[PDB]
A = this chain, B = another copy of it.
Amino acid sequence: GITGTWYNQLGSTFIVTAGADGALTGTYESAVGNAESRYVLTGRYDSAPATDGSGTALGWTVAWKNNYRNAHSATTWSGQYVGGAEARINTQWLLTSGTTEANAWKSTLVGHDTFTKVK
């Protein structure tokens, strides 16, 4: 049930497709990265998660480059998909903007974003 279209609390939509081998592909839009543009996402997840009831570990990388804009930065999400009546993707993300060696200390951000299927 991981495949689908997901939305975060800031409105950023997360269209994702899961493969049987554990692949993860999709797109990203809506502000937080860049205002209105498509960004290609790719990551991985485990195809055989625990059967006792537990979040499905997954993650994906989105580098903000496309045919229009390029912020020289990538946010790489890492969380687990919690199934149930309402599907949830609670993730922690690290936006790493490409900086010089002097500014490399302030290059990487960190945060959290929770994704739901309804919006």
The chain A residues found within 8 Å of chain B, CB to CB, are 10, 21-24, 32, 40-50, 52-65, 70, 72-80, 82, 90-101, 104-112
Cβ–Cβ contact A74 & B92, under 8 A: no
Cross-chain contact of A44 among B49, B62, B82, B111 (Cβ < 8 A):
B62
How many copies the complex holds: the figure is 4
Contact B108 A78 (CB under 8 A): yes
Flag if A46 contacts B70 (CB, 8 Å).
yes
CA distance A96 to B76 in the complex (A): 12
Residues of B close to A57: CB separation below 8 A: 63-64, 72-74, 96-98
Q: Is B80 within 8 A of A98, CB to CB?
A: yes
Q: Which residues of B have CB within 8 Å of A43?
A: 42-43, 61, 63, 74, 76
